[PDB]
Amino acid sequence: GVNSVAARVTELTGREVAAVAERGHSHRWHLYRVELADGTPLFVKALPDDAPALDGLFRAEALGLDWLGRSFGSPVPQVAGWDDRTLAMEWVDERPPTPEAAERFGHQLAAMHLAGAESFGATWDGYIGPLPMDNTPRSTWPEFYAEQRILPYLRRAADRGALTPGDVRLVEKVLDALDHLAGDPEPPARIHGDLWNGNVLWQDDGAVVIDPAAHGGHREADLAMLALFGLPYLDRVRDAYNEVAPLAEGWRARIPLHQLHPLLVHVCLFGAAYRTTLVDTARAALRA
Binding site for Cl ion (CB under 5 A): 15, 36-38, 233, 235-236
- C-alpha–C-alpha distance, residues 209 and 92, integer Å: 10
Q: How far is the CB of 69 from Cl ion (least distance, A)?
A: 22
Q: Which residues contact residue 276 at a Cβ distance below 8 angstroms, ignoring those fewer than 6 apart?
A: none
Q: What share of the chain is helix, strand, coil (3-state, %, to 5)?
A: 45, 20, 35
Q: How far is the CB of 232 from Cl ion (least distance, A)?
A: 8
Out of 38, 125, 194, 222, which one is annotated catalytic?
Answer: 194
Nearer to Cl ion, 34 or 282 (CB): 34
Q: How far is CA 90 from CA 79, 109, 119, 194, 220, in A?
A: 6, 19, 29, 19, 27
Confirm whether 194 is a catalytic residue: yes
Q: How far is the CB of 17 from Cl ion (least distance, A)?
A: 9
- C-alpha–C-alpha distance, residues 177 and 286, integer Å: 8
Instruction: Tell me, letter by letter, the H, E, C secondary structure of 5-67.
Output: HHHHHHHHHCCCEEEEEEEEEECCEEEEEEEECCCCEEEEEECCCCCCCCCCHHHHHHHHHHH
Nearer to Cl ion, 38 or 249 (CB): 38
Nearer to Cl ion, 19 or 170 (CB): 19
The answer to whether 1 and 25 have CB atoms below 8 angstroms apart is no
Nearer to Cl ion, 120 or 241 (CB): 241
Q: How far is the CB of 168 from Cl ion (least distance, A)?
A: 37
Catalytic residues: 194
